[PDB]
Amino acid sequence: NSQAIDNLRASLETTNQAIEAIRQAGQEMILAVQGVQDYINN
């Protein structure tokens, strides 16, 4: 099924965007914990 292959490609493209958003959320969490450490130490 070519339509099945098309749906996999569209779904995986969208899944990759979801993962990138979660990765960005992770970067923000690292900045937040580093800000807590800096406040405690300084």
């Binding site: 779904s11 899944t15 979801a18 958003a21 992770g26 923000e28 969490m29 900045l31 937040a32 406040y39």
Partner: protein, 33 residues
């Protein structure tokens, strides 16, 4: 009295996880159809 506020990082994290939820629901919907 100064205070700790990492609210701009936690808010951006919350926004990114909300966006990820919508993209995953869209991915699931593409496969189902």
């Amino acid at each position: 009295l100064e205070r700790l506020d990492v609210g701009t990082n936690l808010k951006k994290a919350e926004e990114k996880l909300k966006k990820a939820e919508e993209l995953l629901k869209k991915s699931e919907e593409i496969l189902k159809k």
